[PDB]
Amino acid sequence: DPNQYYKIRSQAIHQLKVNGEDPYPHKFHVDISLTDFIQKYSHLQPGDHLTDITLKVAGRIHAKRASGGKLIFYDLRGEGVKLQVMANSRNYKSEEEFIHINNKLRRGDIIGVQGNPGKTKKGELSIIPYEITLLSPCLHMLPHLHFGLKDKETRYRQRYLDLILNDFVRQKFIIRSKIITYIRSFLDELGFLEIETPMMNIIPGGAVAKPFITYHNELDMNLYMRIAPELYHKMLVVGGIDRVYEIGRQFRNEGIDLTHNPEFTTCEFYMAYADYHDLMEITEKMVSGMVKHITGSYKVTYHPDGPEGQAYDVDFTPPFRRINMVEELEKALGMKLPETNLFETEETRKILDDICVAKAVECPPPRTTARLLDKLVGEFLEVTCINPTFICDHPQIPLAKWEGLTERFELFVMKKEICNAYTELNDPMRQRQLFEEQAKAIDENFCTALEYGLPPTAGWGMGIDRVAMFLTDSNNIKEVLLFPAMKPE
Amino acid sequence: SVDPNQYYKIRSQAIHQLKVNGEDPYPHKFHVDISLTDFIQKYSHLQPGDHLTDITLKVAGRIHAKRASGGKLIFYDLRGEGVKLQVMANSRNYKSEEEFIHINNKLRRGDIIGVQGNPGKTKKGELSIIPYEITLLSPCLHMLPHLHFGLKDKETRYRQRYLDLILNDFVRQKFIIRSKIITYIRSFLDELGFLEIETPMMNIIPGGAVAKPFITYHNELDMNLYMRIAPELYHKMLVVGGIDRVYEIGRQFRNEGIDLTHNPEFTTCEFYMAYADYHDLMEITEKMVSGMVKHITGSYKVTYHPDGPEGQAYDVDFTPPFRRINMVEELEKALGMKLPETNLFETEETRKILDDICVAKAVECPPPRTTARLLDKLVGEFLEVTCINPTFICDHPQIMPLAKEGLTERFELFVMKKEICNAYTELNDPMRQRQLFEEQAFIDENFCTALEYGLPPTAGWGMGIDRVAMFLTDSNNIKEVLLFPAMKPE
Numbered sequence: 008d009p010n011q012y013y014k015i016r017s018q019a020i021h022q023l024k025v026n027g028e029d030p031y032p033h034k035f036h037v038d039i040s041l042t043d044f045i046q047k048y049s050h051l052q053p054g055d056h057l058t059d060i061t062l063k064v065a066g067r068i069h070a071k072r073a074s075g076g077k078l079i080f081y082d083l084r085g086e087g088v089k090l091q092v093m094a095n096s097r098n099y100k101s102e103e104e105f106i107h108i109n110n111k112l113r114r115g116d117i118i119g120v121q122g123n124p125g126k127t128k129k130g131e132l133s134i135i136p137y138e139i140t141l142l143s144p145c146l147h148m149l150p151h152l153h154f155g156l157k158d159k160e161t162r163y164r165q166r167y168l169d170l171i172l173n174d175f176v177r178q179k180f181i182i183r184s185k186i187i188t189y190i191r192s193f194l195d196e197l198g199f200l201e202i203e204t205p206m207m208n209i210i211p212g213g214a215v216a217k218p219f220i221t222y223h224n225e226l227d228m229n230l231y232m233r234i235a236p237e238l239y240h241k242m243l244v245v246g247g248i249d250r251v252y253e254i255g256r257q258f259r260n261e262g263i264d265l266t267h268n269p270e271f272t273t274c275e276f277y278m279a280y281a282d283y284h285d286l287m288e289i290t291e292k293m294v295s296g297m298v299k300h301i302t303g304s305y306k307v308t309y310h311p312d313g314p315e316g317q318a319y320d321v322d323f324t325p326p327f328r329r330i331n332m333v334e335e336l337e338k339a340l341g342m343k344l345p346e347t348n349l350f351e352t353e354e355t356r357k358i359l360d361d362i363c364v365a366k367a368v369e370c371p372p373p374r375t376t377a378r379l380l381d382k383l384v385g386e387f388l389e390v391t392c393i394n395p396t397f398i399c400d401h402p403q404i405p406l407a408k409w410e411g412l413t414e415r416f417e418l419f420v421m422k423k424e425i426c427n428a429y430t431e432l433n434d435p436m437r438q439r440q441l442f443e444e445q446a447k448a449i450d451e452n453f454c455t456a457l458e459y460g461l462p463p464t465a466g467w468g469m470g471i472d473r474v475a476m477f478l479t480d481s482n483n484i485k486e487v488l489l490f491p492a493m494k495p496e
Numbered sequence: 497s498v499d500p501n502q503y504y505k506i507r508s509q510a511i512h513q514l515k516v517n518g519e520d521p522y523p524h525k526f527h528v529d530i531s532l533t534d535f536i537q538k539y540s541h542l543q544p545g546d547h548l549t550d551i552t553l554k555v556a557g558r559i560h561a562k563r564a565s566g567g568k569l570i571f572y573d574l575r576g577e578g579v580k581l582q583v584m585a586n587s588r589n590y591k592s593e594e595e596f597i598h599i600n601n602k603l604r605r606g607d608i609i610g611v612q613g614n615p616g617k618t619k620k621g622e623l624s625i626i627p628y629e630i631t632l633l634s635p636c637l638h639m640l641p642h643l644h645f646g647l648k649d650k651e652t653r654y655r656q657r658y659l660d661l662i663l664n665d666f667v668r669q670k671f672i673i674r675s676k677i678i679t680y681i682r683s684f685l686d687e688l689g690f691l692e693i694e695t696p697m698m699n700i701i702p703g704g705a706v707a708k709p710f711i712t713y714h715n716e717l718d719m720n721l722y723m724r725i726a727p728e729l730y731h732k733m734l735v736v737g738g739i740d741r742v743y744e745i746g747r748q749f750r751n752e753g754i755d756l757t758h759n760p761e762f763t764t765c766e767f768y769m770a771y772a773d774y775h776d777l778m779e780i781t782e783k784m785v786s787g788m789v790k791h792i793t794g795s796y797k798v799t800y801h802p803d804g805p806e807g808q809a810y811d812v813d814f815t816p817p818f819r820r821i822n823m824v825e826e827l828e829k830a831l832g833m834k835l836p837e838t839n840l841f842e843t844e845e846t847r848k849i850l851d852d853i854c855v856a857k858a859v860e861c862p863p864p865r866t867t868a869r870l871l872d873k874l875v876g877e878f879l880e881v882t883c884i885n886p887t888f889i890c891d892h893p894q895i896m897p898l899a900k901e902g903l904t905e906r907f908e909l910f911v912m913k914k915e916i917c918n919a920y921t922e923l924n925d926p927m928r929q930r931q932l933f934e935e936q937a938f939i940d941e942n943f944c945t946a947l948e949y950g951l952p953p954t955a956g957w958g959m960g961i962d963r964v965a966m967f968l969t970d971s972n973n974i975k976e977v978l979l980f981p982a983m984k985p986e
């Protein structure tokens with residue numbers, strides 16, 4: 008069993024220490040990465056052996072296949088590449104020390120290799136070791152070679168084991184970092200200032216979201232983990248920093264599952280003297296440019312239900328489809344809806360309720376205008392948004408800006424919102440009124456800031472984790488979080 | 497005269513009157529054709545008296561000064577993006593004389609406005625825009641300080657950062673530099689093949705030690721969580737997983753006192769590199785720091801005022817190579833004497849030798865006068881305060897960790913007598929680490945298990961972004977480099 012293997016191996020390692028062969032006190036200086044070792048010496052023809060060149064490589068042993076006792080082959084792994092170590096007893100420092108190192112090494116051990124490049128008769132590039140050094144043994148039993156960790160729960164609870172055994176996982180978080188790095192580069196080149204704003208607030212945000220509450224001792228007061236940096240960003244726009252963005256963590260005290268995590272990453276930027284239409288060009292350039300630069304093409308494949316399930320083609324080629332919500336809902340329903348400034352009335356609500364019935368689009372027991380419109384929008388518009396599609400001018404039925412239609416777009420990809428933009432409010436009187444009525448159902452410092460004068464501004468937000476899922480062909484959030492929150496063992 | 501509250505009430509009335517009259521400024525939208533900065537670059541070559549009636553442009557900004565020059569002419573000092581441009585509102589050139597007076601009498605100091613007009617330069621030689629139409633966009637409802645005065649009261653600057661940014665341009669340039677420091681680090685490490693990662697800020701076990709943590713309660717899991725102080729354990733688990741070069745520039749949290757050099761949240765950078773030791777990271781730190789200073793500021797030489805502008809100015813020279821000193825030997829050379837052999841630093845006999853030394857050289861040490869604390873004060877007064885230029889101080893004795901001949905393998909880089917970053921050779925013996933976590937006043941068994949799968953020889957590196965931003969913005973408290981610093985209750 009795995010526990011016995013662990014007890015046996017830990018004993019053998021303890022014995023190596025008392026014998027003065029402690030593997031850990033060693034430090035190993037690599038002369039060439041495995042990736043570069045391949046590049047330089049992949050041109051050698053079968054049977055080559057560069058006796059003159061001695062180099063030091065390191066990596067993790069994934070396979071050990073003997074060939075009589077005079078020859079052992081190791082599958083040395085690292086950086087996502089493979090390199091064969093052909094341990095030939097003749098070529099080792101001595102026969103006695105060749106036997107001794109092979110006796111102690113097991114699958115999974117970290118080792119450094121000093122030897123000469125070369126290609127075997129079968130033609131696979133190798134390094135012929137003059138000396139192999141154990142640097143850090145693997146004390147636990149790993150799965151059988153071509154087996155691995157299929158159990159997602161284990162993969163998520165032991166990410167280091169997941170990366171040791173599954174190369175596709177490493178490529179995911181490389182993709183994740185390239186997304187964040189691309190956003191910074193795109194926005195920096197537009198003159199945006201990357202900023203950091205408080206993650207702990209003296210009062211909870213004016214938003215529907217159960218918060219993380221923590222207590223500050225010296226202040227004798229509770230602090231609240233942030234849900235978003237918006238109000239800090241607009242205070243800086245008032246201060247004269249016209250273009251600000253922040254790619255940082257947000258916190259929500261809610262339920263954990265395959266699509267929700269208590270901490271997650273968002274990007275927000277605010278741009279003075281812009282409206283939601285100006286941000287549509289920017290969103291199209293960034294998102295499309297991001298996809299092509301990272302993946303090599305404008306067309307991506309996504310598996311909403313797993314590799315075995317259906318596969319959707321997603322075409323990020325510009326221009327992205329644009330739609331005005333009400334007009335397209337009318338065109339999709341084949342009927343004219345009430346004029347947009349009569350959407351608060353109870354007569355319009357009835358009409359929507361009837362429409363949902365007549366087309367078998369059932370609504371939550373709360374059959375309101377907001378909910379009947381939500382499920383109509385979802386069933387007739389959002390579901391058709393396979394390619395990147397801007398959905399704009401949503402009915403108010405409360406922030407944003409104003410003939411009954413909100414100044415805004417949401418960008419949908421694979422039937423889901425990945426980012427959205429708003430034209431911002433700057434009337435300090437109106438912003439105040441919202442706060443005080445919201446507080447009966449307030450940020451005094453932010454109201455004051457608007458009293459000094461916020462210019463016309465446009466806001467923009469994106470959920471990074473969702474974007475990482477769609478571009479890594481992942482269908483749960485635990486695949487794109489290095490150490491996802493997990494329910495108790 | 498008018499006090500600030502009365503000004504606010506009058507202005508609020510006036511702006512409400514504008515809405516009553518169908519002249520609401522806020523719903524107005526204004527697209528800018530060119531930024532004030534590019535405006536100056538593109539038309540500063542013009543000569544005095546010029547007026548380009550052939551070009552109409554839309555600029556915008558905040559009114560800082562309004563100077564009437566007769567009944568038909570008004571001058572506005574318009575500022576934005578850290579630059580300034582004069583608006584010469586000549587009633588003759590305005591759309592109409594009646595609209596000209598109407599708008600100018602609404603406008604006050606601090607109002608945000610959009611200007612549509614022609615470039616030009618007056619007879620005195622000030623580049624200006626000649627408005628055809630000025631638009632009120634967002635009025636400043638509060639009274640600002642007089643033009644050449646401002647906000648010197650530090651507390652008001654920190655509590656109302658927007659007003660500090662409106663009135664003080666040196667404040668904008670500080671946070672521009674701050675952002676360039678972080679961006680430069682990302683660029684430097686990204687070139688060396690590092691993977692920028694994100695690790696949990698919320699832990700289920702209190703991390704580290706001697707760091708009172710922020711505690712928060714997760715409702716669904718019915719459990720307490722702890723805000724992180726360092727990402728280190730998560731990083732090394734990723735090195736175990738084969739990601740050999742990782743870094744994270746993120747926020748750390750300490751439940752501590754709030755003062756001019758302590759903030760409950762702060763930014764650190766850490767990276768871990770497999771198959772490297774602290775020596776390998778010395779050349780990396782040197783290149784990164786020297787190149788950073790020169791790139792951002794234009795030279796290796798920086799001037800720092802640790803006591804304020806009207807204080808001693810220090811010349812800090814980042815020219816490579818940085819001075820390197822081994823702690824014990826240079827301490828021996830500075831004190832002019834031989835110290836006990838390094839293996840004997842845990843003996844009462846060594847503690848008395850150091851006590852006798854501290855007394856003989858008037859190195860005050862507050863009880864308890866242990867060896868670790870006696871050595872720290874001797875080092876501070878004979879080495880650390882000598883390090884004006886960037887200086888590596890290395891091989892500190894162990895009596896002064898879970899780090900790695902009685903001398904731990906690390907270097908601290910000191911600038912202006914204080915540590916800006918440090919590096920350690922990491923420990924990878926799992927059997928050791930499991931016992932070393934058994935220091936108390938908990939144990940991360942998940943991290944102990946990960947090491948049991950095998951961590952290669954690794955080296956860690958850590959830097960406080962805030963202190964570095966302080967030294968490069970000529971700031972001497974931490975609130976100057978934090979956009980919204982924590983402030984005691986008002």
Ligand SMILES: CC(=O)NCCCC[C@H](N)C(=O)O
Pocket residue numbers: 237275406407408426427428429430431432465466467468469
């Ligand atoms: C008016 C408004 O909704 N402001 C919020 C910030 C701007 C929108 C952006 N998409 C966001 O909230 O992230």
Ligand SMILES: CC(=O)NCCCC[C@H](N)C(=O)O
Pocket residue numbers: 728766897898899900918919920921922923955956957958959
């Ligand atoms: C051995 C040790 O103290 N490790 C801690 C993490 C590595 C050092 C790094 N410079 C840091 O603590 O930030």
